[PDB]
Nucleic acid binder design. Structure first.
Length: 323
DNA sequence: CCGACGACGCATCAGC
DNA sequence: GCTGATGCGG
DNA sequence: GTCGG
């Protein structure tokens, strides 16, 4: 319908983020492309698009130029720009952000081949991101996410059957494919007012059975790393996948699951509704708001449904949290 | 006109 | 060495 | 870049 327009706007977003270091412009172009991508008519003019929330004067002017000519002069130019195209490309390496990509290109390091020749100048995260560059850009089919979940839940229970672990993200909402695996972990002994090896024990067990293959970062409450399904003796091996594991206090765990299940638009709507019912919900807690807007103490939450009950919402299955 | 636009854990750097 | 800032990813 | 107080 409008794929030329939303492709144009996405590409402009990337250069704002990765080259100009203008994160809010990045998000403006992304929000514009989203609302256009949901529009169920083929756009005929910039004025037509400008009536949508998030499309302003300047993007309307760009849509007019694209509709009249089939391209955008500024985008054509920055595409052919060796310096800018190289900075934009190098941020596809996990661990290389706009600042690192700038530094590398400044000193003549422009391609993956150049990075491979300059391992010295890459930190540990960036080396992993380079090692799995192609794998990390592949999506994960749901059937593999199910096999990964099998392993995660089994090994967690093997460490301590009192752990609770939930794979969240779009997978939990039923998505047919995922970009990564997001695991939320808690244990009855870990509360907000309460051991600095609860997460370590679980990471270690997944390493011992050779599911987790690399570590990008690891502290007492957050692990970011790499995993891979076991290959079947003779079949081609599975791509390496990104997995995060977060340990959350038990009394904050279901607020955590709700939040990291999303979707992002659902979260906005749920918190909007919660505010107009006199509650403030964030990633950690739901708290009542007094008549002058002072937040009270966090309310007890022992399930996701508790959160819905507080705000007078019928329980919504993750499958039905698209918005 | 002009400020908001998410907050935060972990790795690493800058400064002392 | 320690403390705070920055980069980065989510 | 867009929105809105």
């Amino acid at each position: 319908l409008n794929g030329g327009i939303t492709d144009m706007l996405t590409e402009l977003a990337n250069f704002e983020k990765n080259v100009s270091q203008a994160i809010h412009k990045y998000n403006a172009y992304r929000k514009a492309a989203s609302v256009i991508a949901k529009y169920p008519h083929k756009i005929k003019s910039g004025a037509e698009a400008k009536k949508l929330p998030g499309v302003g004067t300047k993007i309307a002017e760009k849509i007019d130029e694209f509709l009249a000519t089939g391209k955008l002069r500024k985008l054509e130019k920055i595409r052919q720009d060796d310096t800018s195209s190289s900075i934009n490309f190098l941020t596809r390496v996990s661990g290389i952000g706009p600042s690192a990509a700038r530094k590398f290109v400044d000193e003549g390091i422009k391609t993956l081949e150049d990075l491979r020749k300059n391992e010295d100048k890459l930190n540990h995260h960036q080396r992993i991101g380079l090692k799995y560059f192609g794998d990390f850009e592949k999506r994960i089919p749901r059937e593999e996410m199910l096999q990964m979940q099998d392993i995660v839940l089994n090994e967690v229970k093997k460490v301590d059957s009192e752990y609770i672990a939930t794979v969240c993200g779009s997978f939990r909402r039923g998505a047919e494919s995922s970009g990564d695996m997001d695991v939320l972990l808690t244990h009855p002994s870990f509360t907000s007012e309460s051991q600095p090896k609860l997460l370590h024990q679980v990471v270690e067990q997944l390493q011992k059975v050779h599911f987790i293959t690399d570590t990008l970062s690891k502290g007492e409450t957050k692990f970011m790393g790499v995993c891979q399904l076991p290959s079947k003796n003779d079949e081609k091996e599975y791509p390496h996948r990104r997995i995060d594991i977060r340990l959350i206090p038990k009394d904050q765990y279901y607020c955590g699951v709700l939040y990291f299940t999303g979707s992002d638009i659902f979260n906005k709507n749920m918190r909007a509704h919660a505010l107009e019912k006199g509650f403030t919900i964030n990633e950690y807690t739901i708290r009542p708001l007094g008549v002058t807007g002072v937040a009270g103490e966090p309310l007890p939450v022992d399930s996701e449904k508790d959160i819905f009950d507080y705000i007078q919402w019928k329980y919504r299955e993750p499958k039905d949290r698209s918005e």
